[PDB]
Amino acid sequence: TSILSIVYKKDDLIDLSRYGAKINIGDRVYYDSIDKNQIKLINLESSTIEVILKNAIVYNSMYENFSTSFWIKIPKYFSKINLNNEYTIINCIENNSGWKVSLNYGEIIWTLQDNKQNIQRVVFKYSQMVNISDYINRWIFVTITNNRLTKSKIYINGRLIDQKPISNLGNIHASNKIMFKLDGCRDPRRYIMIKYFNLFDKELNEKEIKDLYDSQSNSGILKDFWGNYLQYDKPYYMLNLFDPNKYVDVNNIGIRGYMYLKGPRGSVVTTNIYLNSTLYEGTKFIIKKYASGNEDNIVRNNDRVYINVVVKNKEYRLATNASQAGVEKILSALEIPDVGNLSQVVVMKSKDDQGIRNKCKMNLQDNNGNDIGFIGFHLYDNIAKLVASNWYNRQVGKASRTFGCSWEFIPVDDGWGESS
Amino acid sequence: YASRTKVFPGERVEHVTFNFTLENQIHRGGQYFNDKFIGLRLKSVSFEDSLFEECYFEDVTSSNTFFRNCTFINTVFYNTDLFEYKFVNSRLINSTFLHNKEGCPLDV
Ligand SMILES: *[C@@H]1O[C@H](CO[C@@H]2O[C@@H](C)[C@@H](O)[C@@H](O)[C@@H]2O)[C@@H](O[C@@H]2O[C@H](CO)[C@@H](O)[C@H](O)[C@H]2NC(C)=O)[C@H](O)[C@H]1NC(C)=O
Ligand SMILES: *[C@@H]1O[C@H](CO)[C@@H](O)[C@H](O)[C@H]1NC(C)=O
Ligand SMILES: *[C@@H]1O[C@H](CO)[C@@H](O)[C@H](O)[C@H]1NC(C)=O
């Protein structure tokens, strides 16, 4: 049911569908080292991806429903130069007729234009004043459905954001060639990243789109704050979803010292452009592989690893005393050699028992393979102290809402621009 | 007290530190480039029409201190009680506030 499917291969891009669409690539198109199937397009002329379709599959009908899907990553807009600068990223418009996706300050837009130059637009709008954003500089699954008889709808991560009737529109033509380049952007240092572009000759429903989201989500591999692959030996800042205005901190080194959530988080501001909350606050959490036999530095589900802690640019270890009072017992950072037989083994957990994707959670386990439990926080005399407990596991068994067993890993990225 | 107020219209400053205490002053039209302000107390000091660029404010406590019509670029406010009501009609660009002191939301 797929007509175009741009997928990475041996130092090139090919089409999975049985149509053999011609592909040509510029000399300035880049690829991520770990996840090469994600494509970076910078604001230049040579940064071009041209895909040519077959005359038998060119959209030239008036009742033909069709859908598209892709993954997109849009860096932060830093200055006023980006305001009111609607710039195009994909065109299939010829003779002022076709379909185009474009980007504006906190906006992603679908545009359809028939032979009569009638314009229909569907928009997704995300703010940039928020404390922590789910969209800024993070991967977004954008899919777009077009039913010529009812409406045209936009889906962000599988959920409905906007819909607009298109019954008035007449015959919509499409270009034989489809476009990938930043077009109409005044900013010379603005890029995007794109991943998995798919086209379908029918209107997709909620079920099929959710299935596609889940399929392309790579639920069996851990993800960081920016939606990329989690890697070992890389320093990560830590965020708790349920308490996101505090950061992990230490007070004393060793067992007598406790790691806690200290706050509040600071701010980064640019008056009228962005007023986010600082993400580079606290103590880094390096991940060290223990038993994962995989050659890649990519972290997968159910992996058994160790976690280093960077305190005054020195690397310590997570461990807790298994034998102490209660279940919600305190974790600590200790000298690497002096761990002894303290519980240090952690299991990385992304998808649940049924395989439904959720955020990163770590399960402390002992040498005997007994679950100390999920890592989270609990308040002892007004201090939000880090604890590993099986209470989270109990609520998971009861299908209850666990509180604090969900963590988020934030590496330093150029798309955020914060000063460390 | 208001009669005794001192005024310094215009001053350009290059790389240098600034730990001191000022009382009843107005600095106007200042242009400070990459200047760090460590361990200073401000009592009724106002900066007007000033430009701070790659500045650094640390351990700053201020009473009746304002930054009006000021522009901050790539500046960092570390361990300061300079809350958002002390920047009157200012413009901050790529600026960070870290570890803000505890204080009242308004002037006391
Ligand atoms: C605001 O910052 C961003 C990011 O720059 C980083 O953060 C700054 C505070 C400072 O610490 C820099 O050294 C950091 O690199 C700027 O956007 C980037 O600017 C750099 C130029 O050094 C350029 O190489 C990148 O391509 C820019 N990225 C984008 C997407 O434009 C931005 O320019 C700063 N704002 C202003 C007004 O200059
Ligand atoms: C600040 O520095 C000056 C010299 O630059 C010095 O005279 C003064 O004593 C310093 N203040 C403190 C608190 O040390
Ligand atoms: C200070 O602001 C005034 C108006 O509020 C403006 O005319 C002036 O240019 C500003 N000063 C500088 C140095 O730009």
Author numbering:
A (entry chain B): 876 to 1295
B (entry chain A): 480 to 587
Show me the paper's own sentences about this structure.
Synaptic vesicle glycoprotein 2a (SV2A), a putative membrane transporter in the synaptic vesicles (SVs), has been identified as a target of LEV and BRV. SV2A also serves as a receptor for botulinum neurotoxin (BoNT), which is the most toxic protein and has paradoxically emerged as a potent reagent for therapeutic and cosmetic applications. SV2 family proteins belong to the major facilitator superfamily (MFS) with 12 predicted transmembrane helices. In addition to the transmembrane domain (TMD) core, a cytosolic N-terminal region and a large fourth luminal domain (LD4) are present.
The quality of the cryo-EM map is sufficient for modeling the SV2A and HCA2, except that the peripheral region of the HCA2 shows poor density. Additional masked local refinement improved the map quality covering HCA2 and SV2A LD4 (LD4A). Masked local refinement revealed the well-ordered densities of the N-glycans at the binding interface. The open edge of the β-strand from the β-hairpin of HCA2 forms backbone hydrogen bonding interactions with the open edge of the C-terminal β-strand from the β-helix structure of LD4A. In addition to the backbone–backbone interaction, the SV2A His578 side chain forms a salt bridge with the BoNT/A2 Glu1156 side chain. SV2A Phe576 contributes to the van der Waals interactions with Ser1142 and Val1144 of BoNT/A2. The protein–protein interaction between HCA2 and LD4A creates a relatively small binding interface with a buried surface area of 464 Å2. To enhance this interaction, N-glycans attached to LD4A contribute to binding. A N-glycan containing two N-acetylglucosamines (NAG)s and fucose (FUC) attached to Asn573 forms extensive contacts with HCA2. The BoNT/A2 Phe953 and the aliphatic portion of the BoNT/A2 Arg1064 form the van der Waals contacts with the two NAGs attached to LD4A.
